[PDB]
Amino acid sequence: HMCDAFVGTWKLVSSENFDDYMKEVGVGFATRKVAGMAKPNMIISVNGDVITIKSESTFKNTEISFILGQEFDEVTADDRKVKSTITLDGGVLVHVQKWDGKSTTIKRKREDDKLVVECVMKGVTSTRVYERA
Numbered sequence: 671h672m673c674d675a676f677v678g679t680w681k682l683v684s685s686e687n688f689d690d691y692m693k694e695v696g697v698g699f700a701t702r703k704v705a706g707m708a709k710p711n712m713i714i715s716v717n718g719d720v721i722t723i724k725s726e727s728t729f730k731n732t733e734i735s736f737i738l739g740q741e742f743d744e745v746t747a748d749d750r751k752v753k754s755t756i757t758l759d760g761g762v763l764v765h766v767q768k769w770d771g772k773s774t775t776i777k778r779k780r781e782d783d784k785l786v787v788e789c790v791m792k793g794v795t796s797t798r799v800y801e802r803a
């Protein structure tokens with residue numbers, strides 16, 4: 671029952687400072703522009719100890735499956751090859767991605783009927799708000 675309130679199908683309904691976040695991460699111009707248009711569907715499911723998060727959009731379709739606290743390989747939508755660890759901290763799913771001596775943290779939080787996602791790279795924060803599909 672660890673992630674019950676996250677399970678479901680969610681659709682992006684607002685974005686703030688995302689282009690700047692992607693710049694900070696190192697995404698190039700053309701990818702930033704196309705990726706910034708996307709309205710991804712985030713699909714979260716749990717089977718035993720395995721959590722699966724899928725993101726489907728015109729830009730890219732991605733899927734990760736993981737056990738909390740257990741590092742894995744991820745190729746991100748923008749084609750970074752990262753080492754990821756996802757934990758639960760006070761009811762927030764905290765996803766840390768490490769690559770090339772860099773790190774970014776993506777926090778997924780349930781707030782009212784929304785799922786609020788905060789993406790942080792150094793001093794740059796972006797907020798991505800999702801609602802139930």
Ligand SMILES: O=C(O)[C@H]1CCCN1C(=O)Nc1ccccc1-c1ccccc1
Pocket residue numbers: 682692695697705706708710725727729730746747748776787789798
């Ligand atoms: O898209 C989102 O809302 C954010 C928050 C949940 C995971 N995610 C990303 O991984 N986004 C990205 C991060 C870096 C570069 C590109 C993306 C991206 C952009 C459009 C579609 C899918 C991922």
